Amino acid sequence: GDELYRQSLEIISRYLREQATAGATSRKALETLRRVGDGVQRNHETAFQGMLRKLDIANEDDVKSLSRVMIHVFSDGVTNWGRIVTLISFGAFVAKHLKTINQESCIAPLAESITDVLVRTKRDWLVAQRGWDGFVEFFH
Ligand SMILES: CS(=O)(=O)NC(=O)c1[nH]c2cc(Cl)ccc2c1CCCOc1cccc2ccccc12
Ligand SMILES: CS(=O)(=O)NC(=O)c1[nH]c2cc(Cl)ccc2c1CCCOc1cccc2ccccc12
Ligand SMILES: Oc1ccccc1-c1cc(C(F)(F)C(F)F)[nH]n1
Numbered sequence: 001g002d003e004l005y006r007q008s009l010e011i012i013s014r015y016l017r018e019q020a021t022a023g024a025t026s027r028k029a030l031e032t033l034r035r036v037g038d039g040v041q042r043n044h045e046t047a048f049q050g051m052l053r054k055l056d057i058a059n060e061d062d063v064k065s066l067s068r069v070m071i072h073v074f075s076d077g078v079t080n081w082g083r084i085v086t087l088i089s090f091g092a093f094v095a096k097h098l099k100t101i102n103q104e105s106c107i108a109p110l111a112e113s114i115t116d117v118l119v120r121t122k123r124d125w126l127v128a129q130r131g132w133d134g135f136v137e138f139f140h
Contacts, residue, residue, distance in 0.1 A: 004119060004123070004126060004127065004131050004132075005115065005119050007023070007025060007026050007029070007131065007132050008115045008118060008119055008132070009111070009112065009115045010022065010026050011026055011029050011030050011033060011132065012033075012088060012091070012111045012114055012115050012118075013108060013111040013112070013115070014030055015030060015033050015034065015037060015088070015092055016091060016092050016095040016107050016108075016110060016111040016114075017095070017107060017108070017111070018034070019092045019093075019095040019096040019099065019107075020095060020096070020098070020099035020104050020107055025131070025132050025133055025136070026132065028132075028136045029132035029133075029135055029136055032135060032136050032139050032140075033085065033088065033135075035139075036085055036089075036139045037085060037088060037089040037092055040085060040086050040089035041089050041092060041093055044086075044089070044090075044093075048090055048093045051090075052093065052094065052097055055094075057094060057097060057098070057101075057103075058101065058103070059103060059106070060103070060105070060106045060109065063094075063098070063103075063106040063109060063110050063113075064109070064113070066094070066110065066113060067113045067116070067117060070087065070113070070114065070117040071117055071121060073087060074117075074121045074122065079122060079125050081129075081134070081135055081138045081139065084118065084122070084135075085135075085139070087114070087118070088114060088118075091110060091111070091114045094110060095107045095110060095111075098110070
């Protein structure tokens with residue numbers, strides 16, 4: 001299979017779903033993402049609220065449009081765990097919004113889309129970092 005994709009989809013999907021409601025690397029990475037991601041979201045509440053209101057997300061077609069938006073984030077050439085975890089954290093903020101507006105059916109597609117953009121765009125950097133073990137190390 002594709003173990004990095006499997007792990008990434010499991011970690012990101014679980015964190016996003018937890019906004020509405022396994023191997024050791026995945027458990028430790030989800031613990032880390034909860035702790036770090038919740039802090040990122042708290043420290044960005046006002047900023048995330050402002051951008052989200054401009055995105056104007058009401059349904060699955062709006063959520064689908066975010067794939068190309070996320071690909072454009074990585075176009076600045078910045079690759080580090082801070083940028084990656086903050087991208088995931090705004091995704092979680094969107095998932096909370098999808099819960100509020102009764103569009104939870106869009107959360108698993110959103111998590112797959114974040115996973116797809118991250119692993120297609122940054123596969124080779126993620127592998128060099130040893131993946132989610134690198135993530136756990138960075139944020140310890
Ligand atoms: C697919 S597109 O070309 O039609 N639209 C965008 O890429 C797009 N749409 C946005 C809507 C809002 Cl509300 C905000 C931003 C956009 C974007 C730009 C996407 C890339 O933005 C960034 C690029 C690089 C770093 C960033 C850091 C923090 C936030 C955004 C960053
Ligand atoms: C670590 S940083 O200092 O470089 N900051 C970010 O990476 C950053 N800052 C943000 C501010 C807002 Cl208001 C919203 C998002 C960010 C981010 C993360 C990179 C931009 O992410 C996105 C930007 C635009 C739309 C997105 C939709 C789904 C998931 C992420 C999206
Ligand atoms: O919360 C942490 C614990 C240990 C090491 C680093 C962090 C951390 C870094 C960031 C960030 F803001 F820089 C974000 F960009 F990742 N948030 N939390």
